[PDB]
Ligand binder design. Structure first.
Ligand SMILES: Cc1cc2nc3c(=O)[nH]c(=O)nc-3n(C[C@H](O)[C@H](O)[C@H](O)COP(=O)(O)OP(=O)(O)OC[C@H]3O[C@@H](n4cnc5c(N)ncnc54)[C@H](O)[C@@H]3O)c2cc1C
Length: 295
């Protein structure tokens, strides 16, 4: 029932860019763009929590054709316009240091995508992934630990839950559980979808809690810069008591390196009640209630 690999890299869907909008505001670090693709002409269908491949043009340094790169789908199954005609991505331009031969190195597929113009055609494959699916249970609790572009699966959950046009389009999914997003970025202009995240929390103050960890603007109790792991440490007992509910799911998305600090905090929380988190977490993983996708 879950759509997967409707398109494969030997014969990918040639979609077309509708829009390419900036998500990082003035005064922020880096470039993250919201890119929306036209899916008409084909049959790419997808749900929340899945990814797609994009194959960038050109060859590598060895002269071989470039391979696909996976990106978390940033839209619900219906697309941003709730017309079931498009798909959106949340793409950050990878750029890095001198000791990788040169000076600043720019990632192939990410630079391509963040600079791509409306009207351009793109090789799209997928969808893929069953690790990050949203439960159909409206009474489910959904904890969302995200940094940077790991917001993208979170945005698909939240939009389906809380957007007026989504509610009207999903008679069966009228969310009434609780959801809690801890979102980690370096500055306030780097809060992707800040306006819409905060508006969702205004409409649904009892069903959505939004928590930020902004490193360049906030210190943890030890005097260091604030990260997502610090906010989880700070709310560890609440987060543990939510996790004990049979209906509670937890999603972790973003660049790799966050999972350790999150675990040590929940380890100290669980231990208070004579539970070793790492084994309890094994059972949550088998139960399909502990979702992680870092990269
Ligand atoms: C399931 C999944 C979902 C993803 N979702 C998203 C998403 O929603 N948004 C998004 O922006 N990205 C996402 N990514 C990452 C994305 O797929 C690409 O890896 C990323 O965009 C960079 O690709 P590129 O083509 O720009 O870089 P490449 O040109 O392949 O450059 C990457 C390579 O350069 C090196 N490198 C990278 N960073 C550094 C560094 N700091 N120092 C030294 N060397 C380095 C490594 O060898 C790495 O393999 C996702 C990845 C996966 C696996």
């Amino acid at each position: 029932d879950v759509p997967v690999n409707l398109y494969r890299p030997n014969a990918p869907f040639i979609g077309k860019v509708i829009s390419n909008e900036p998500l990082v505001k003035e005064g922020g670090i880096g470039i993250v763009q919201h890119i929306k693709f036209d899916l008409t002409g084909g049959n790419l269908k997808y749900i929340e929590g899945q990814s797609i491949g994009i194959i960038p043009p050109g060859v590598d340094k060895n002269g071989k054709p470039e391979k696909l790169r996976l990106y978390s789908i940033a839209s619900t199954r219906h697309g941003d316009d709730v017309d079931d005609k498009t798909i959106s991505l949340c793409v950050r331009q990878l750029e890095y240091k001198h000791p990788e031969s040169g000076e600043t190195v720019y990632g192939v597929c990410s630079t391509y995508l963040t600079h791509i113009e409306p009207g351009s055609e793109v090789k799209i494959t997928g969808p893929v992934g069953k690790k990050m699916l949203l439960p159909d249970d409206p009474e489910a609790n959904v904890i969302m630990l995200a940094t940077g572009t790991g917001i993208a699966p979170m945005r698909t959950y939240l939009w389906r839950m809380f957007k007026d046009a989504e509610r009207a389009a999903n008679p069966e999914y009228q969310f009434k559980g609780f959801s809690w997003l801890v979102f980690g970025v370096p500055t306030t202009p780097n809060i992707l979808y800040k306006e819409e995240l905060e508006e969702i929390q205004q409409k649904y103050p009892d069903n959505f809690r939004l928590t930020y960890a902004i490193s360049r603007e906030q210190k943890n109790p030890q005097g260091g810069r604030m990260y997502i792991q610090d906010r989880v440490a700070e709310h560890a007992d609440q987060l543990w008591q939510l996790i004990k509910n049979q209906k509670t799911h937890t999603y972790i998305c973003g660049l790799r390196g966050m999972e350790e600090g999150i675990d040590a905090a929940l380890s100290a929380a669980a231990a208070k009640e004579g539970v070793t988190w790492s084994d309890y977490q094994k059972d949550l993983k088998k139960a399909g209630r502990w979702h992680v996708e870092t990269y």
